Ligand binder design. Structure first.
Ligand code: MET
Ligand SMILES: [Zn+2]
Length: 544
């Protein structure tokens, strides 16, 4: 049995969970659930990313402490993820004592090992508020076209890009004061020292080909030292021996993966597992599910930080593309920027889990939630292919056979075709070829419904003396359903619970080798109802 630690990217504490987050957390959860079904020791770890200037300023605007604000959003996030049945073993915070101690430890080791440099830089500073301004907190007049009220390093009228130091009549977004250039000592992590190590990782064949190709572009451009400090005022961890300096959020954020695992171990009273998973000699596997926009941090800075502080590196990064809705980036004006909480007011979690899983693969590709296709595909595949095998057969079993399935399989050869597919389906889940797994499962569902059609139970049921035939046919259909629901168990947790209640058995991967024979099933009310476009229209309207 493998030991596996899986993470999803840590959501920022200053925004609600939306469908883009859900693509990532669902992808990881399906994989995790499959790994658990195969008997491995799995630790699925996440946390909120709770530090930084935007969070500090948002709390001040609200008139509450950053601690109060991040606590409220942590609860909101966890409520939403729980509503999608994301099965974390721990959900922590980057604002935690575990992360503080690990961040200080890693920094101290990097510094002792020669990988931290000090250099003075010049940056725009708000002298009224008394703080350095990140680019997006500077506004002013575009130097090229002279359009007013442009933010940061680009103009939204003419498209020009420039340093915010080129803005005409610049103003602080925080206070309205004119910012000025001011010097400050910063601490830099010497990423270039790890170039050769990182290039060897890129060539090893572990990473997605598309990621390795992108890393070659980054090596070609040239790795640079990374500014890992920020001046007070800041919401984050103060740097030891450097009063008024804090770790930049992105230094502490991936350390939060470690902090969340440490927290889990400590709450369990487990004094051995942290080192077993994070020491250089670990035989455990470490996987990060992440999106395209944060690959640089996870493929360059993070393995280098770990190497330089005597910790093991990720076994692999699993990168996914962006979500689109109706083919386009989510759009607030069109009502396609959809929050996870809003989704659940209109649809169940399983429907979105299924739809995303049917489109996901081991490559980086944007995943399109086409809302018309969502209705058609959920209805066709879940209602009319898979659940249909239970719903068309269970009534006869309950009403005419006292709930008891036949004592032998009617078609053992067909059953073996279903169980023989377990190897290819499992390998598809394992390899993250989720769309392939779904295609194989739905091809089997088509075969199962073809079998039932060929036996014509709606004819058999009306014909004198054919009770045994009817029980045989319907039991066969229910056994095929048992197998398909096992293959779909990582994808559809709530439907699976309903199926397990009907079948009076827990679904296990190996259990499909023993069909249900001479076995009592329970009645059910609909396992899964149809959806329609009126519900989609309501979701979109509610999201505007
Ligand atoms: C250590 S992963 C941090 C991810 C970051 N909060 C983001 O949402 O992009
Ligand atoms: Zn302009």
């Amino acid at each position: 049995a493998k030991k596996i630690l899986v993470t999803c990217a840590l959501p920022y504490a200053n925004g609600s969970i939306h469908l883009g987050h859900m693509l990532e957390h669902i992808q990881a959860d399906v994989w995790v659930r499959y790994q658990r079904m195969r008997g491995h020791e799995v630790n699925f770890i996440c946390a909120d990313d709770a530090h930084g200037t935007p969070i500090m300023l948002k709390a001040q605007q609200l008139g509450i402490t950053p601690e109060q604000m991040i606590g409220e959003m942590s609860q909101e996030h966890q409520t939403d993820f729980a509503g999608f049945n994301i099965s974390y073993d721990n959900y922590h915070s980057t604002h935690s004592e575990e992360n503080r101690q690990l961040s200080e430890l890693i920094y101290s080791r990097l510094k002792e090992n020669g990988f931290i440099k000090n250099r003075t830089i010049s940056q725009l500073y708000d002298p009224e508020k008394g703080m350095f301004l990140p680019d997006r907190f500077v506004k002013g007049t575009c130097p090229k076209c002279k359009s007013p009220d442009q933010y940061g390093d680009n103009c939204e009228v003419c498209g020009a890009t420039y340093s915010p130091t080129e803005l005409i009549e610049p103003k602080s977004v925080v206070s309205g004061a004119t910012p000025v250039m001011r010097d400050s000592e910063h601490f830099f992590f010497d990423l270039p020292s790890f170039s050769e190590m990182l290039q060897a990782w890129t060539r090893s064949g572990a990473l997605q080909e598309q990621v390795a190709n992108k890393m070659q572009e980054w090596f070609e451009s040239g790795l640079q030292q990374w500014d890992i400090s920020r001046d007070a005022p800041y919401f984050g961890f103060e740097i030891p021996n450097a009063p008024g300096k804090y770790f930049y959020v992105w230094l502490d954020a991936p350390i939060g993966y470690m902090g969340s695992f440490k927290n889990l171990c400590d709450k369990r009273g487990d004094s051995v597992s942290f080192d077993e998973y994070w020491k250089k000699d670990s035989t455990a596997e470490l996987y990060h599910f992440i999106g395209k926009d944060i690959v640089y941090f996870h493929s360059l800075f993070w393995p280098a930080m770990l190497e330089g502080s005597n910790f093991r590196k990720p076994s692999n990064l699993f990168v996914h593309g962006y979500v689109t809705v109706n083919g386009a980036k989510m759009s607030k004006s069109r009502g396609t920027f959809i929050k996870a909480s809003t989704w659940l007011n209109h649809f169940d979690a399983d429907s979105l889990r299924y739809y995303y899983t049917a489109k996901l693969s081991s490559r980086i590709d944007d995943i399109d939630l086409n809302l018309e296709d969502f209705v058609q595909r959920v209805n066709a595949d879940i209602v009319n292919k898979v659940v249909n095998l239970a719903s068309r057969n269970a009534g006869f079993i309950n009403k005419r056979f006292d709930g008891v399935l036949a004592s032998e399989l009617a078609d053992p050869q067909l059953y073996k075709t279903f169980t023989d597919a377990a190897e290819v389906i499992g390998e598809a889940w394992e390899s993250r070829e989720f769309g392939k797994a779904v295609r194989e499962i739905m091809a089997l569902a088509d075969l199962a419904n073809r079998y039932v059609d060929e036996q014509a139970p709606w004819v058999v049921a009306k014909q004198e003396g054919r009770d045994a035939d009817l029980q045989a046919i319907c039991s066969m259909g229910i056994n095929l359903f048992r197998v398909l629901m096992t293959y779909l168990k990582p994808v559809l947790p709530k439907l699976t619970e309903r199926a397990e209640a009907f079948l009076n058995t827990e679904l296990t991967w190996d259990g499909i080798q023993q069909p249900l024979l001479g076995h009592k099933v329970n009645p059910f009310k609909a396992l899964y109802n149809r959806i329609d476009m009126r519900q989609v229209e309501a979701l979109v309207e509610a999201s505007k």
